[PDB]
């Protein structure tokens, strides 16, 4: 998967 | 992100504009 998945908040 | 964001939206938009066209 991606190395830096985006997140909420 | 914006490209991946709208690209995720558009990919299912068709299933909601083209399938719904068949009274769905």
PDB file of N, CA, C and O in Angstrom:
ATOM      1  N   UNK A   1       0.829  -1.212   0.000  1.00  0.00           N
ATOM      2  CA  UNK A   1       0.000   0.000   0.000  1.00  0.00           C
ATOM      3  C   UNK A   1       0.858   1.255   0.000  1.00  0.00           C
ATOM      4  O   UNK A   1       2.077   1.158  -0.167  1.00  0.00           O
ATOM      5  N   UNK A   2       0.257   2.449   0.137  1.00  0.00           N
ATOM      6  CA  UNK A   2       0.994   3.710   0.170  1.00  0.00           C
ATOM      7  C   UNK A   2       1.883   3.754   1.414  1.00  0.00           C
ATOM      8  O   UNK A   2       1.603   3.089   2.413  1.00  0.00           O
ATOM      9  N   UNK A   3       2.970   4.517   1.361  1.00  0.00           N
ATOM     10  CA  UNK A   3       3.903   4.645   2.472  1.00  0.00           C
ATOM     11  C   UNK A   3       3.444   5.704   3.473  1.00  0.00           C
ATOM     12  O   UNK A   3       3.873   5.683   4.624  1.00  0.00           O
ATOM     13  N   UNK A   4       2.567   6.616   3.055  1.00  0.00           N
ATOM     14  CA  UNK A   4       2.044   7.701   3.873  1.00  0.00           C
ATOM     15  C   UNK A   4       0.550   7.882   3.571  1.00  0.00           C
ATOM     16  O   UNK A   4       0.171   8.779   2.815  1.00  0.00           O
ATOM     17  N   UNK A   5      -0.320   6.976   4.044  1.00  0.00           N
ATOM     18  CA  UNK A   5      -1.750   7.092   3.802  1.00  0.00           C
ATOM     19  C   UNK A   5      -2.281   8.359   4.479  1.00  0.00           C
ATOM     20  O   UNK A   5      -1.851   8.698   5.589  1.00  0.00           O
ATOM     21  N   UNK A   6      -3.161   9.092   3.797  1.00  0.00           N
ATOM     22  CA  UNK A   6      -3.757  10.306   4.337  1.00  0.00           C
ATOM     23  C   UNK A   6      -4.790   9.885   5.394  1.00  0.00           C
ATOM     24  O   UNK A   6      -5.444   8.843   5.251  1.00  0.00           O
ATOM     25  N   UNK A   7      -5.061  10.748   6.367  1.00  0.00           N
ATOM     26  CA  UNK A   7      -5.999  10.490   7.455  1.00  0.00           C
ATOM     27  C   UNK A   7      -6.864  11.723   7.733  1.00  0.00           C
ATOM     28  O   UNK A   7      -6.517  12.820   7.283  1.00  0.00           O
ATOM     29  N   UNK A   8      -8.011  11.572   8.414  1.00  0.00           N
ATOM     30  CA  UNK A   8      -8.887  12.690   8.748  1.00  0.00           C
ATOM     31  C   UNK A   8      -8.292  13.456   9.942  1.00  0.00           C
ATOM     32  O   UNK A   8      -7.207  13.118  10.431  1.00  0.00           O
ATOM     33  N   UNK A   9      -8.987  14.480  10.438  1.00  0.00           N
ATOM     34  CA  UNK A   9      -8.501  15.227  11.593  1.00  0.00           C
ATOM     35  C   UNK A   9      -7.337  16.177  11.318  1.00  0.00           C
ATOM     36  O   UNK A   9      -6.562  16.458  12.233  1.00  0.00           O
TER      37      UNK A   9
ATOM     38  N   UNK B   1      -5.244  15.612  -0.878  1.00  0.00           N
ATOM     39  CA  UNK B   1      -5.159  15.089  -2.230  1.00  0.00           C
ATOM     40  C   UNK B   1      -6.393  15.588  -2.973  1.00  0.00           C
ATOM     41  O   UNK B   1      -7.467  15.688  -2.376  1.00  0.00           O
ATOM     42  N   UNK B   2      -6.282  15.794  -4.281  1.00  0.00           N
ATOM     43  CA  UNK B   2      -7.385  16.285  -5.077  1.00  0.00           C
ATOM     44  C   UNK B   2      -7.575  15.458  -6.333  1.00  0.00           C
ATOM     45  O   UNK B   2      -8.716  15.138  -6.649  1.00  0.00           O
ATOM     46  N   UNK B   3      -6.498  15.039  -6.999  1.00  0.00           N
ATOM     47  CA  UNK B   3      -6.619  14.244  -8.210  1.00  0.00           C
ATOM     48  C   UNK B   3      -7.209  12.886  -7.854  1.00  0.00           C
ATOM     49  O   UNK B   3      -8.273  12.522  -8.343  1.00  0.00           O
ATOM     50  N   UNK B   4      -6.611  12.207  -6.875  1.00  0.00           N
ATOM     51  CA  UNK B   4      -7.066  10.896  -6.420  1.00  0.00           C
ATOM     52  C   UNK B   4      -8.460  10.998  -5.798  1.00  0.00           C
ATOM     53  O   UNK B   4      -9.183  10.008  -5.720  1.00  0.00           O
ATOM     54  N   UNK B   5      -8.795  12.162  -5.230  1.00  0.00           N
ATOM     55  CA  UNK B   5     -10.068  12.440  -4.582  1.00  0.00           C
ATOM     56  C   UNK B   5     -11.188  12.499  -5.621  1.00  0.00           C
ATOM     57  O   UNK B   5     -12.141  11.728  -5.544  1.00  0.00           O
ATOM     58  N   UNK B   6     -11.081  13.375  -6.620  1.00  0.00           N
ATOM     59  CA  UNK B   6     -12.115  13.482  -7.650  1.00  0.00           C
ATOM     60  C   UNK B   6     -12.115  12.242  -8.551  1.00  0.00           C
ATOM     61  O   UNK B   6     -13.181  11.823  -8.999  1.00  0.00           O
ATOM     62  N   UNK B   7     -10.968  11.577  -8.743  1.00  0.00           N
ATOM     63  CA  UNK B   7     -10.877  10.375  -9.572  1.00  0.00           C
ATOM     64  C   UNK B   7     -11.633   9.202  -8.941  1.00  0.00           C
ATOM     65  O   UNK B   7     -12.100   8.305  -9.640  1.00  0.00           O
ATOM     66  N   UNK B   8     -11.785   9.226  -7.625  1.00  0.00           N
ATOM     67  CA  UNK B   8     -12.510   8.217  -6.860  1.00  0.00           C
ATOM     68  C   UNK B   8     -14.008   8.516  -6.985  1.00  0.00           C
ATOM     69  O   UNK B   8     -14.835   7.611  -7.111  1.00  0.00           O
ATOM     70  N   UNK B   9     -14.360   9.803  -7.016  1.00  0.00           N
ATOM     71  CA  UNK B   9     -15.727  10.274  -7.137  1.00  0.00           C
ATOM     72  C   UNK B   9     -16.283   9.970  -8.538  1.00  0.00           C
ATOM     73  O   UNK B   9     -17.321   9.315  -8.675  1.00  0.00           O
ATOM     74  N   UNK B  10     -15.562  10.388  -9.583  1.00  0.00           N
ATOM     75  CA  UNK B  10     -15.918  10.221 -10.990  1.00  0.00           C
ATOM     76  C   UNK B  10     -16.085   8.758 -11.399  1.00  0.00           C
ATOM     77  O   UNK B  10     -17.008   8.439 -12.155  1.00  0.00           O
ATOM     78  N   UNK B  11     -15.289   7.856 -10.825  1.00  0.00           N
ATOM     79  CA  UNK B  11     -15.328   6.425 -11.138  1.00  0.00           C
ATOM     80  C   UNK B  11     -16.619   5.738 -10.705  1.00  0.00           C
ATOM     81  O   UNK B  11     -17.005   4.709 -11.264  1.00  0.00           O
ATOM     82  N   UNK B  12     -17.320   6.316  -9.729  1.00  0.00           N
ATOM     83  CA  UNK B  12     -18.588   5.777  -9.249  1.00  0.00           C
ATOM     84  C   UNK B  12     -19.746   6.665  -9.710  1.00  0.00           C
ATOM     85  O   UNK B  12     -20.861   6.172  -9.865  1.00  0.00           O
ATOM     86  N   UNK B  13     -19.460   7.905 -10.136  1.00  0.00           N
ATOM     87  CA  UNK B  13     -20.451   8.852 -10.635  1.00  0.00           C
ATOM     88  C   UNK B  13     -21.164   8.244 -11.839  1.00  0.00           C
ATOM     89  O   UNK B  13     -22.381   8.332 -11.959  1.00  0.00           O
ATOM     90  N   UNK B  14     -20.405   7.570 -12.702  1.00  0.00           N
ATOM     91  CA  UNK B  14     -20.919   6.905 -13.886  1.00  0.00           C
ATOM     92  C   UNK B  14     -21.948   5.856 -13.484  1.00  0.00           C
ATOM     93  O   UNK B  14     -23.041   5.820 -14.034  1.00  0.00           O
ATOM     94  N   UNK B  15     -21.644   5.059 -12.469  1.00  0.00           N
ATOM     95  CA  UNK B  15     -22.535   4.015 -11.969  1.00  0.00           C
ATOM     96  C   UNK B  15     -23.801   4.623 -11.354  1.00  0.00           C
ATOM     97  O   UNK B  15     -24.760   3.907 -11.093  1.00  0.00           O
ATOM     98  N   UNK B  16     -23.816   5.929 -11.080  1.00  0.00           N
ATOM     99  CA  UNK B  16     -24.922   6.672 -10.522  1.00  0.00           C
ATOM    100  C   UNK B  16     -25.625   7.606 -11.523  1.00  0.00           C
ATOM    101  O   UNK B  16     -26.676   8.170 -11.203  1.00  0.00           O
ATOM    102  N   UNK B  17     -25.123   7.717 -12.753  1.00  0.00           N
ATOM    103  CA  UNK B  17     -25.678   8.558 -13.822  1.00  0.00           C
ATOM    104  C   UNK B  17     -26.081   7.716 -15.030  1.00  0.00           C
ATOM    105  O   UNK B  17     -27.107   7.946 -15.662  1.00  0.00           O
ATOM    106  N   UNK B  18     -25.290   6.689 -15.319  1.00  0.00           N
ATOM    107  CA  UNK B  18     -25.467   5.773 -16.428  1.00  0.00           C
ATOM    108  C   UNK B  18     -26.309   4.568 -16.012  1.00  0.00           C
ATOM    109  O   UNK B  18     -27.061   4.074 -16.858  1.00  0.00           O
ATOM    110  N   UNK B  19     -26.259   4.104 -14.750  1.00  0.00           N
ATOM    111  CA  UNK B  19     -27.074   2.938 -14.378  1.00  0.00           C
ATOM    112  C   UNK B  19     -28.454   3.418 -13.971  1.00  0.00           C
ATOM    113  O   UNK B  19     -29.470   2.840 -14.345  1.00  0.00           O
ATOM    114  N   UNK B  20     -28.518   4.564 -13.317  1.00  0.00           N
ATOM    115  CA  UNK B  20     -29.761   5.172 -12.898  1.00  0.00           C
ATOM    116  C   UNK B  20     -30.590   5.568 -14.116  1.00  0.00           C
ATOM    117  O   UNK B  20     -31.821   5.571 -14.035  1.00  0.00           O
ATOM    118  N   UNK B  21     -29.945   5.700 -15.285  1.00  0.00           N
ATOM    119  CA  UNK B  21     -30.581   6.030 -16.556  1.00  0.00           C
ATOM    120  C   UNK B  21     -31.546   4.939 -17.004  1.00  0.00           C
ATOM    121  O   UNK B  21     -32.411   5.173 -17.841  1.00  0.00           O
ATOM    122  N   UNK B  22     -31.438   3.772 -16.393  1.00  0.00           N
ATOM    123  CA  UNK B  22     -32.225   2.578 -16.586  1.00  0.00           C
ATOM    124  C   UNK B  22     -33.147   2.467 -15.368  1.00  0.00           C
ATOM    125  O   UNK B  22     -33.180   1.443 -14.691  1.00  0.00           O
ATOM    126  N   UNK B  23     -33.818   3.580 -15.030  1.00  0.00           N
ATOM    127  CA  UNK B  23     -34.756   3.749 -13.913  1.00  0.00           C
ATOM    128  C   UNK B  23     -34.223   3.186 -12.585  1.00  0.00           C
ATOM    129  O   UNK B  23     -34.999   2.840 -11.692  1.00  0.00           O
ATOM    130  N   UNK B  24     -32.898   3.150 -12.402  1.00  0.00           N
ATOM    131  CA  UNK B  24     -32.306   2.615 -11.186  1.00  0.00           C
ATOM    132  C   UNK B  24     -32.220   3.703 -10.115  1.00  0.00           C
ATOM    133  O   UNK B  24     -32.266   3.394  -8.932  1.00  0.00           O
TER     134      UNK B  24
END
